Structure formats: structure tokens, C-alpha cells
Design a protein around this nucleic acid. Structure first.
Lengths: 311, 312
DNA sequence: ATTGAACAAAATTTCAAT
DNA sequence: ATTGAAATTTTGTTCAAT
């Protein structure tokens, strides 16, 4: 009684799993084209072919709402990434970072920047704007040397150009050998306004770093091999090379007190402190940072965002 | 790459399908052109926004797989839909599934044996690159001096290697030696044996079954010297790795298969996953003899050939 | 219930413009 | 690149036709 059902199931499939024409189907079945159309209608009617309007948008909205409540943030943006490998996440996040900055930055904003290959990516997306009275400042200390390009210079430059301003560098190394040295530098007439502008910034954009032995800070030699072994133990991640713990506290003030850059606690004051991070290799650093309540805007992927809530 | 267009596009697709609205109609509510609406719908399908699934009695597909999954004692049986019953049409579709399966299957530190074949090469091309490490990929099948079609042997194993962040282990030997003694002491050469041994160590194996007709050039390259060509034609049903067998999956002539190069057949049964991709209306006899020989424990086959199998 | 020419409404897609 | 207009198939739909 049901050799028709089989045909309807057979023909309907060809027209959906082969991208076949109605007339393509009528050829092999040696039947009329109108008949084939009727068969397809019949299959839809009894539900041999069922159609679904999956919309991840809704999912992402709600997930964000949880992170907003969980860590008490102003904004949480969950960005869809098709892949959970680090690279794919980075790219998708980066491009959203760009868009957000473009939408967010208004005439007369004071914008603090950092460097990082993360940070560079967000910048690279064009994000140009006819904005006025905007200034852009370096928040993170620099290097003597590195095996990879830091892209530090170009990073802040591109930000500047895009905002019809020019860069305020912080022309200092990330770490001084001695704390007294560090104190006396930050007080210099010129240096101080740069740090002060750092603190004045109403926008701040940064990533959090990893603990892998492939970290730039580990490689470059401004840290004791002996102390790094101890420091790594107590430090989940870093923002601008100030290291925190699983509760967001400075793991070592001894070392932090000889580290250059705007101060972590300053971040809490800022009208928008924007963390972009993601990647399942980084989840440890993100929890610490949000616990420290250093960000009030979070940009994160759904892989990492899932791992943060469901834990 | 706009949040609004993704939202607007999906809403329109939702409207067109769910409430059964015409593109013209959708264009009314959205106050846009009819062509635009059509493009939006295409975009939604493209990014997988709208998903269409076809359901049926299990016989048609799925269980169609389980019945022989259990009949031949195979671990896995995958029946792939092909819109047509000719070889090319089937091969193409099987090939693409082959690629996907390998991508899902191959894990860090696998030993992967492959072969060559017009079949094998398409699976190879449709292979997806993968973030995997410690993987090794080895040649299981002997080679040729010459052929009228390109064997694609080299590129086949190369593409597999590249995709798995390893490099190729070739077997630099002819498929057949004139004399069995020659063959034996070649296999014992310290360099060669590492390769054959790695062949036996492989926990994954991927191969097709060449039919009697297919290896007519094996017949035609002066091997088997004909007095054996006859013996093989009538008896053998197929050939995996240019080794032959009969309908009950048994080496047809051990005399001949003792001067043949490649990873031994019986080794295939030992492997954690031995994956046969074959199908085709003209090629069922071979599959019959390969699955009976208990060589494969994973089968990838089309529905035309799969039904013809259950008709024994 | 059921074909299928012939017609008729419905998407596809090039063509031109912005 | 994008949007509509315009033409062309592509899907549906009346009609009993040869």
C-alpha cells in the first residue's frame, strides 16, 4: 500500500541531498515533472522532510546574560566561533573587538591600549572613524628584544590613525631590576603624564596572558629563572604583565612593584574596561581576571564562555 | 559579516518556511525587493541557518546498515546515499564520505596504512587537514613500472601525510617479483622490513577491493604468465592490495601471492580498524569475498551495492 | 485517488545602475 | 558589493486534451 511513500521519500531526498532539479528527478523516475512536484509536497505534508530554523543568536544572547550576572559585569559579548582551536577563536574575537571599539569610541574619549598579537588583530580590522578630540595611550611596558615581533608600535599606531589622533607611547621597559629605580622613573616630569593619562583613560582594551613556558615574559630575560618558577606557581594569568591569582590578587607585590605599566586596580575605575580573551587554553586566566573585577566588558567566544558558566 | 543581516536573513527564512510565505510576501512585510529576499534565503541555507533532514523506514537506510553490520560480523557499516547506480556516481560520493570518516577517526599517535587506487586518490583529495600529532602514514600496496592511467599513488599517500602533520612512508618495491625467493629476501632487507613491519603495526587501514576486470593490466604487464591468468580470472573475485582471493575470502594461489609485495592480507584482520571503501553495480562479487574473508571491520558502501549484498 | 500537457505563479540569476 | 529590474528557468496549478 506504500510504494508511493518510498518514492516520495526517495525522490524528495534526491531533491535535497543531490541538489537535483524537479526535472532531474522526473528523468530517472521516468515520470512527469508535475507529478514529482506533488510527491515532494506529499513528503513535506507527512513529514518525511522536516526543516529547522536553527538560530544561534538567541543562544548566545542568553549565555551572555549569565556571565553578566555571574561576574557582575556591565556587558558580556559572546561571539560565535566555528572552531574551538585557538587560532579560529582568536580571529573571530579579534574582528568583533574592532567593531565594538568602532561603535563605542566617541568624541573626546581617552583610550588606553596594550600590546599582544591578540591586541594587534583587533586593531588591524579597519575600524576608521571621523572622531575628534580622541587620544590613545600605551598601558603596557615594552621589550628590549623578542624572537617574534610584538607589533606593539603598529598596534597603538593603527589605533591612533583610526581615531584621527596620534600615539602616546610609554617609552619604558616592562621591568626594572630594582624597585627604587622603577619608582623614580615613574615620577619623571614627562613619564608621569603618560601614566596619568593611562589612569585618566575612560576606555581600556586588553587581553589576559597564558602560563605556558612560551610566554614572552618567560622567554625574554627580565625575570629570575628561580623566581619565575615560584611566580608561575602563584600566577594564573596577567594583564599588561601584572600577574594575578585565582582570586584576582597580585600574587607577588615584590615583583609587581618593579613592573612598568598602568596599575591593575585603576582598571576597575574605568567607565569601560574591555577584556578580549578566549581559547580553552586560557580559561584559568579569564576566571582570575573577572574575579578581580578588572573588566566590566567581556568579549569571549562560546567555547570558552560555555566552560566558564558550566563549571 | 553583519549582526543585523544574519538576524534579518534568518527571520525571513523562518517566515518563508515556517509560515509558508512567498518571497514576494516576505518582501511585503520587510519592505524590500523580491530578488533580495531570495538571496537572503540562499544565504541562510549556505551558512546552515536552515537545516533540512529526510526520514524514512529504517530499511531504506541506517538499519539497512545494521543488518549486514551483524550478518558479516563487521564492527561498523556505513551506507552512503548515491543518486545514481553507475560506478563513477557512487565512487564520487563514497570518496567524500571516506574523507570525512578518516577526519573523524584518525587520532594522535595512530599508525595509518593506505593503498593506491582511483578510489583511494579521491578520498585522499577530499581529505580534511587536521591538528593531529605523532601520526604516521604508510604504503600498504606494491607499485608499477608503467600504466596507461596515472596511478596517483605518490600524491595519494602524500596528501594523507600532509593532512596529518606527518610525512609519507613509501614502499619502494614492485608489486610482483618473478621469483618467490627473490621476494622473500627483499622483504628481509633492513630498510624495507621497517616499512613492512610498520605496515603490520598500523592500527588503521584504508583500501578498496580491485576487481578481476580492474587488474587486467596487472594481468597485462606480463605477470602471471597467463597459464596463471586463467587460474586467477575464474577463481578470484577481487584483489585487495594487488593480492587476490576467491568468493570465500581465501588467497586464490599462494604460489602467486608468495611472490607478491605488500602488507599481508591476514594482517588486516588484526587491525583495530580495517576500512574498506568499495561500491558499484559491476563490483559486488569482490565485496562479497572481502567481507567473507573477514578482512574489513569497517565498510563504507553505497545503497545500490548495499541492497545487492543483502540479496544473497 | 491519479496523470500530465499547457498554463500559471515562483524562484534564479544576469544585467544594469548606484 | 549591493540592490532592484528584467528575463528565464523553476516550481506549482488548472484543466480534461491526443
Amino acid at each position: 500500500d506504500r510504494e508511493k511513500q518510498q518514492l516520495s521519500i526517495e525522490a524528495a531526498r534526491l531533491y535535497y541531498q543531490s541538489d537535483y532539479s524537479q526535472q532531474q528527478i522526473a528523468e530517472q523516475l521516468n515520470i512527469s515533472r508535475p507529478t514529482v512536484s506533488r510527491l515532494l509536497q506529499y513528503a513535506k505534508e507527512k513529514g518525511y522532510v522536516q526543516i529547522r530554523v536553527m538560530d544561534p543568536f538567541e543562544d548566545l544572547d542568553a549565555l551572555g546574560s549569565i556571565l553578566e550576572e555571574k561576574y557582575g559585569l556591565l556587558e558580556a559579548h559572546v561571539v560565535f566561533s566555528p572552531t574551538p582551536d585557538y587560532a579560529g577563536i582568536t580571529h573571530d574575537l579579534s574582528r568583533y573587538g574592532a567593531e565594538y571599539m568602532h561603535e563605542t569610541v566617541k568624541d573626546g574619549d581617552i583610550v588606553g591600549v596594550s600590546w599582544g598579537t591578540t591586541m594587534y588583530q583587533i586593531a588591524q580590522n579597519m575600524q576608521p572613524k571621523q572622531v575628534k578630540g580622541v587620544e590613545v595611550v600605551q598601558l603596557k611596558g615594552g621589550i628590549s628584544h623578542s624572537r617574534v615581533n610584538t607589533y606593539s608600535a603598529e598596534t597603538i599606531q593603527l589605533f591612533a590613525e583610526a581615531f584621527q589622533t596620534m600615539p602616546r607611547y610609554l617609552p619604558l621597559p616592562v621591568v626594572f631590576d630594582n624597585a627604587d629605580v622603577k619608582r623614580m622613573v615613574e615620577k619623571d616630569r614627562h613619564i608621569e603624564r603618560i601614566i596619568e593619562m593611562g589612569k585618566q583613560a575612560n576606555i581600556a582594551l586588553f587581553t589576559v596572558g597564558t602560563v605556558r613556558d612560551e610566554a614572552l615574559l618567560f622567554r625574554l630575560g627580565y625575570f629570575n629563572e628561580e623566581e619565575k618558577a615560584l611566580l608561575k606557581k602563584q600566577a594564573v594569568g596577567d594583564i599588561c604583565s601584572r600577574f594575578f591569582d585565582a582570586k584576582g590578587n597580585i600574587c607577588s607585590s615584590a615583583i609587581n612593584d618593579r613592573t612598568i605599566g598602568v596599575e591593575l586596580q585603576d582598571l576597575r575605575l574605568k567607565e569601560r574596561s574591555i577584556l578580549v580573551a578566549g581559547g580553552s587554553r586560557k580559561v584559568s586566566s579569564i576566571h582570575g581576571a573577572l574575579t578581580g573585577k578588572y573588566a566590566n566588558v567581556l568579549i569571549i567566544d562560546q567555547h570558552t564562555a560555555r566552560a566558564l558558566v558550566n563549571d
